[PDB]
Amino acid sequence: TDRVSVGNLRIARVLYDFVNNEALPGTDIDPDSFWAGVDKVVADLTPQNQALLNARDELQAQIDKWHRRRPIDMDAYRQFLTEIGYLLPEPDDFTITTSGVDAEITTTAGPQLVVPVLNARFALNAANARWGSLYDALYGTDVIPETDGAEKGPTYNKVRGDKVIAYARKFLDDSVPLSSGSFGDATGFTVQDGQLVVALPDKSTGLANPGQFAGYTGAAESPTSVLLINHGLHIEILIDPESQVGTTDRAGVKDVILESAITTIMDFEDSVAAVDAADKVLGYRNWLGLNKGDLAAAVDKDGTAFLRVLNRDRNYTAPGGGQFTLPGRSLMFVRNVGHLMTNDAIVDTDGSEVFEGIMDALFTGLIAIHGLKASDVNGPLINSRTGSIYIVKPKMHGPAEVAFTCELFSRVEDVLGLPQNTMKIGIMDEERRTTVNLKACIKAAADRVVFINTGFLDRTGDEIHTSMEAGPMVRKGTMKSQPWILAYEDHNVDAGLAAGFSGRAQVGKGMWTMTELMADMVETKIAQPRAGASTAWVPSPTAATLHALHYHQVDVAAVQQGLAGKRRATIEQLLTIPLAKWAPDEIREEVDNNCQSILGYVVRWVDQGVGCSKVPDIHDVALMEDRATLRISSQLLANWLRHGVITSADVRASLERMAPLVDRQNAGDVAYRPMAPNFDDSIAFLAAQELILSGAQQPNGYTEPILHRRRREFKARAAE
Numbered sequence: 001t002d003r004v005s006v007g008n009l010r011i012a013r014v015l016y017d018f019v020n021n022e023a024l025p026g027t028d029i030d031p032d033s034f035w036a037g038v039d040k041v042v043a044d045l046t047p048q049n050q051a052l053l054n055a056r057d058e059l060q061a062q063i064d065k066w067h068r069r070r071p072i073d074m075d076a077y078r079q080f081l082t083e084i085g086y087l088l089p090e091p092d093d094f095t096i097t098t099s100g101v102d103a104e105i106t107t108t109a110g111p112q113l114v115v116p117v118l119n120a121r122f123a124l125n126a127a128n129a130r131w132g133s134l135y136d137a138l139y140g141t142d143v144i145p146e147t148d149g150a151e152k153g154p155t156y157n158k159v160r161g162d163k164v165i166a167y168a169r170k171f172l173d174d175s176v177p178l179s180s181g182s183f184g185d186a187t188g189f190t191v192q193d194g195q196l197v198v199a200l201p202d203k204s205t206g207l208a209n210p211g212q213f214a215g216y217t218g219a220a221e222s223p224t225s226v227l228l229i230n231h232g233l234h235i236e237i238l239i240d241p242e243s244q245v246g247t248t249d250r251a252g253v254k255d256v257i258l259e260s261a262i263t264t265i266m267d268f269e270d271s272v273a274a275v276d277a278a279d280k281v282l283g284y285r286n287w288l289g290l291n292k293g294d295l296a297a298a299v300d301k302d303g304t305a306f307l308r309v310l311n312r313d314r315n316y317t318a319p320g321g322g323q324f325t326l327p328g329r330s331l332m333f334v335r336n337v338g339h340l341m342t343n344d345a346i347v348d349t350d351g352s353e354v355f356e357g358i359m360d361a362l363f364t365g366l367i368a369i370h371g372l373k374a375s376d377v378n379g380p381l382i383n384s385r386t387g388s389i390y391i392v393k394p395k396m397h398g399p400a401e402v403a404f405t406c407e408l409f410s411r412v413e414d415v416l417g418l419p420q421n422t423m424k425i426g427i428m429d430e431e432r433r434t435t436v437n438l439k440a441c442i443k444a445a446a447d448r449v450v451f452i453n454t455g456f457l458d459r460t461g462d463e464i465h466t467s468m469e470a471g472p473m474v475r476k477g478t479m480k481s482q483p484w485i486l487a488y489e490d491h492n493v494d495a496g497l498a499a500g501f502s503g504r505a506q507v508g509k510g511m512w513t514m515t516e517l518m519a520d521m522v523e524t525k526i527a528q529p530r531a532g533a534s535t536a537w538v539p540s541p542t543a544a545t546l547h548a549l550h551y552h553q554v555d556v557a558a559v560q561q562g563l564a565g566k567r568r569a570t571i572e573q574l575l576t577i578p579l580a581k582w583a584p585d586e587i588r589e590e591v592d593n594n595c596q597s598i599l600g601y602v603v604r605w606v607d608q609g610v611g612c613s614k615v616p617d618i619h620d621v622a623l624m625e626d627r628a629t630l631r632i633s634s635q636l637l638a639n640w641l642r643h644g645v646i647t648s649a650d651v652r653a654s655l656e657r658m659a660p661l662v663d664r665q666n667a668g669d670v671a672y673r674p675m676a677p678n679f680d681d682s683i684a685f686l687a688a689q690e691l692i693l694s695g696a697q698q699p700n701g702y703t704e705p706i707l708h709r710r711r712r713e714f715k716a717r718a719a720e
């Protein structure tokens with residue numbers, strides 16, 4: 001109670017001061033009125049937030065019980081779901097009306113990067129990732145095998161760099177073909193009569209489609225770069241005969257830059273650990289520096305002191321000679337937490353903590369005002385040309401919960417003195433009660449929705465928890481082939497396209513989690529635009545630039561017109577629970593893999609407040625772990641345990657097997673403290689144990705209650 005009272009709220013000082021001193025100035029909002037609206041909004045919406053949480057609990061207990069009385073009669077099951085209000089009727093057809101949305105969303109198909117907002121260095125990089133080097137992406141990853149002397153080394157390897165160049169030349173041929181011949185034989189480029197002219201050994205050539213020439217830099221007769229466009233994404237050939245790569249190139253080409261992460265999601269949710277006012281202030285401050293345009297982070301390359309800042313916009317000459325400008329930064333969404341958790345950043349008179357999702361709207365809405373204009377006090381950055389603020393709302397269960405978000409935004413808009421529908425919603429489709437009512441969810445947000453996205457990891461976590469009592473589930477790597485998930489994915493696209501999303505809102509698909517396996521990403525992740533998704537999630541800038549390749553090969557707008565108005569998934573498919581028909585080596589492998597990934601993720605969450613980590617699985621595949629991959633592992637094991645496939649002792653023994661391995665993976669991190677051999681003195685080990693043995697008891701299988709409590713424990717113990 002260094003807490004400032006305002007109405008019935010008791011606001012942590014660090015938050016109060018950050019809001020008044022940093023966030024509020026320049027927004028033209030009177031601070032007294034701000035705080036009294038925070039108070040009114042919290043008092044008015046809290047009881048409905050609680051009622052919606054109680055309803056999830058009520059629905060689950062009814063489902064548990066139904067399974068416990070009960071080979072599933074699917075008609076009887078649908079019926080039961082209809083009677084308790086889980087499965088509601090599908091509304092009449094409609095088209096969404098959302099307006100004031102930027103083209104990066106309504107129109108441009110391309111990769112969407114997600115990043116932990118608490119990590120300024122990564123958050124900057126992500127905003128800067130709208131524009132990335134294809135050469136660095138190819139040279140630095142396994143896309144180009146290290147085969148036939150193309151191995152990376154201390155020095156530029158010309159055998160490898162020549163392979164990169166060729167790979168890029170073919171890409172240029174496929175995306176922006178010349179009228180005659182190949183980019184592989186280009187000797188130079190000029191601009192003549194406002195056309196791109198490409199010099200060959202024969203032969204000068206224009207482009208088969210001259211509308212793919214977007215502009216250039218430098219002199220017409222001797223350009224420093226050539227900007228091209230295909231499928232609404234830009235491609236920049238940098239020309240420099242004198243650069244290290246350029247001198248080795250037939251046309252003195254130094255690099256190919258792809259426009260990649262057209263949008264970026266600055267994440268408050270599953271990729272960060274933020275358990276108290278101090279943690280939330282850290283992320284709100286980074287969100288603030290992003291929208292003001294002044295965020296920075298000291299960066300070290302070869303023991304020289306650099307500063308990472310936001311990219312400035314990019315200046316070009318139009319084909320016909322005028323100057324213009326393309327955005328240097330990807331358009332930023334912010335992902336707020338969902339409806340579940342409270343946070344002690346504010347408590348009321350009785351010391352009850354305030355719902356965090358309510359706070360996130362208020363505070364991330366407030367701070368987003370700075371990126372709606374340029375001024376000294378707002379900073380130079382403008383995030384939206386149309387004045388929209390873009391908020392991803394995760395983990396919603398059903399249309400009532402969407403309507404409640406929309407009402408929250410509406411209430412917040414009045415507090416912030418913003419027009420109604422300024423605050424846009426990106427709806428995660430990642431909970432079962434949302435999937436099976438998806439059209440009504442879209443409908444509840446028909447004037448705010450800017451995206452739907454299959455958050456498949458959370459979605460599998462809910463799948464396991466929802467049917468926890470039905471029997472043992474299949475192994476988690478066997479989920480991808482189950483009818484529920486295949487119908488889920490097609491159904492999401494169907495519903496977005498039937499609601500008129502094409503040309504208006506993103507249809508998005510999920511995250512590639514194998515951070516190092518890029519050759520695989522480039523081979524496999526093309527399926528998502530081919531399925532109609534105008535965007536999909538990538539884990540890094542490098543993965544954005546690589547994924548952009550797929551949007552050049554697939555014409556997603558043409559895909560979408562060819563799928564629109566076609567129903568491909570049925571309710572019954574969507575509701576088919578992934579029940580199993582295992583040898584003990586198969587159970588051992590599943591349990592140990594789940595345990596290893598749990599421990600390796602939780603130990604850095606609890607001990608270090610890192611909410612997204614790269615953690616090798618049992619096969620040494622480096623996986624991106626966040627709360628959602630945790631939700632799956634801990635729910636699958638709780639489900640095996642529930643049904644007697646494994647015992648408690650089994651889980652404990654596995655956890656003891658793998659803790660020493662995680663400790664080894666983490667040695668050479670000077671800040672790491674081992675779990676072994678004193679497992680019970682490890683709050684992080686106990687967290688991982690609790691997530692599994694209490695897993696069935698967690699609401700919707702969510703990991704935040706145990707993780708937030710354990711991280712706070714850990715801070716408290718670090719304090720004395």
Ligand SMILES: CC(C)(COP(=O)(O)OP(=O)(O)OC[C@H]1O[C@@H](n2cnc3c(N)ncnc32)[C@H](O)[C@@H]1OP(=O)(O)O)[C@@H](O)C(=O)NCCC(=O)NCCS
Nearest residue numbers: 114115116121122125126271539540612613614624625626
């Ligand atoms: C998995 C993850 C933690 C890997 O990062 P890591 O183990 O700490 O370190 P790596 O060596 O692989 O990469 C660090 C470098 O890549 C960049 N990087 C990695 N992920 C990035 C992201 N999302 N945005 C911007 N840059 C990123 C960093 O900026 C850094 O480059 P720099 O030295 O120039 O600053 C990570 O990619 C991440 O936190 N981001 C995306 C995941 C997400 O947001 N959701 C969770 C999905 S499972």
Ligand SMILES: [Mg+2]
Nearest residue numbers: 370373379381
């Ligand atoms: Mg600004």
Ligand SMILES: [Mg+2]
Nearest residue numbers: 430455458628
């Ligand atoms: Mg999710």
